[PDB]
Chain A
Amino acid sequence: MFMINILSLIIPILLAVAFLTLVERKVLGYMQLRKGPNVVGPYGLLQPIADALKLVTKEPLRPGTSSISMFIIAPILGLSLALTMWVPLPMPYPLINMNLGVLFMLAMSSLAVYSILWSGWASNSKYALIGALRAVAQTISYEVTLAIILLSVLLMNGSYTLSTLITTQEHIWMIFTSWPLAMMWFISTLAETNRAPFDLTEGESELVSGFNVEYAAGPFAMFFMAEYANIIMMNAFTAILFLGASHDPHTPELYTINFVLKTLALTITFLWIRASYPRFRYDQLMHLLWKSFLPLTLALCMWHISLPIMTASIPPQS
């Protein structure tokens, strides 16, 4: 039965990724006075299937200068991390219930930077390596703000347990208590998934596709699935962290509906950023992180350590 739980978690997530491709294309199209996929199936509903089928029957050109061991290990690591990021998530009850769930997510997402450091190195070409190094530096630099923002927010939670976030946000959203940290967290999440003006590793008009140039068909498809799973997962984490839904122990379907709707709204906002802004330069986003986000994050961590102590509002640790 637990195996069935794992399967009924993984497979719907991959399906949601597949149709997130369609949803993103349609949202971009309608923001651009066009339609997007509306021919292949009703309202493009069979388009993700067409993409998945075409990709797995397309020739996966592997580079002659590629260390194939890591060339295939990188997609495995990426997709395995992208899937395992959902196992502690408290759609009302988690698959895996840990004391340190958000710490587990921080660690697992920090292991995901290897899939770029290994793909760029394995692909050789002597230039995709530079794009991979830029991506890794961006990822590790925004890990700092992710970690510190999570630390400051959880000082109202009292623990690293994600189920406790539901209890913490019973009467009020955590957004009303930490909105500046919410904006910085949301932009950090944007930057970590290489999205929006932070998509420097796959700049369509900067370096064509960067670290993913040599990957084609199948491994490219799995990398794409990993990225979109990470996008939906990060938006789910954001919804649980800042927009906690009311929970009825006798009707958890209500919480699930609430959470899914809020996660979809945040994902649609992620696609909304993509259609509205130009692209940051690499040094420009590094400057943003290091000289704008980091000082405010340090100050707000200070503030959120001081605040529960000076108001006798320290949460329980149980």
Chain B
Amino acid sequence: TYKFVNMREPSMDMKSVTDRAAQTLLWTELVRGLGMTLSYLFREPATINYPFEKGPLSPRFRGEHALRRYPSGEERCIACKLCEAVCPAQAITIEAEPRADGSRRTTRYDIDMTKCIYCGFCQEACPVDAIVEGPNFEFSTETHEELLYNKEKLLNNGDKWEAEIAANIQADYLYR
């Protein structure tokens, strides 16, 4: 099924022709436009008072990355390199080795946040919920170099944001 958008012929009688002449000479549809703008002037604006008010987000929101720990304080990352393998932008650089206690742990874990596309594939690939994208989205920097994250930087991000990261994960893990 289809429909025509502009297949109406105007009526050609006295009253219709006079209606169109009055519309031509008295600018009635221009007055309708003025009325629409005037009606919008008396509507409450949709503006929010940033930064005192914030745009609404969801637990699934993909922001700044973080490396997480177990309740014991032990790191979750066991350096499987799945996130580095799946990373569409090749933003993840990993080096690992046996730790002094024998654990399988990273010695390098870099994310080039200027290479990153913030797709969240890394946190999908991760089998232990080690790498996540956190809720933070206000981390603009004055230099390019502060956006090339380190393992220390990402672990400090995890320690900084774990309280709300864990709540978001608890909110959404049953969908995953």
Contacts and interface: CB of A to CB of B under 8 A. Distances in A.
Interface of A: 27, 29-35, 183, 272-273, 275-277
Interface stretch (B31-39, B81-89, B124-132, B146-154): B31-39
A34 B36 contact: no
27 contacts: A27-B41, A29-B45, A30-B40, A30-B45, A31-B37, A31-B38, A31-B40, A31-B41, A32-B40, A33-B40, A33-B43, A33-B45, A33-B46, A34-B45, A34-B46, A34-B47, A35-B45, A35-B47, A183-B27, A272-B34, A272-B37, A272-B38, A273-B34, A275-B37, A276-B33, A276-B36, A277-B33
Contact of A30 (B27, B30, B34, B41): B41
Interface of B: 27, 30, 33-34, 36-38, 40-41, 43, 45-47
Contacts of A27: 41
A195 to B, nearest CB: 15
Contacts of A35: 45, 47
A273 B31 CA distance: 10
Nearest to A29: B45
Contacts of A272: 34, 37-38
Nearest to B46: A33
Contacts of A277: 30, 33
A277 B34 CA distance: 9
A107 to B, nearest CB: 31
A183 B24 CA distance: 13
Given A35-B45, A275-B37, A277-B33, 20 more contacts: A27-B41, A29-B45, A30-B40, A30-B41, A30-B45, A31-B37, A31-B38, A31-B40, A32-B40, A33-B40, A33-B45, A33-B46, A34-B45, A34-B46, A183-B27, A272-B38, A276-B30, A276-B33, A276-B36, A276-B37
B39 to A, nearest CB: 9
A58 B87 CA distance: 45
A183 B27 CA distance: 10
A32 B43 CA distance: 10
> Which of A27, A35, A276 is most buried by chain B, counting CB atoms within 10 A of its CB?
A276
A31 B43 CA distance: 8
Contacts of B45: 29-30, 33-35
Nearest to B43: A33
B5 to A, nearest CB: 19
B37 to A, nearest CB: 5
A128 B38 CA distance: 36
Nearest to A275: B37
A4 to B, nearest CB: 39
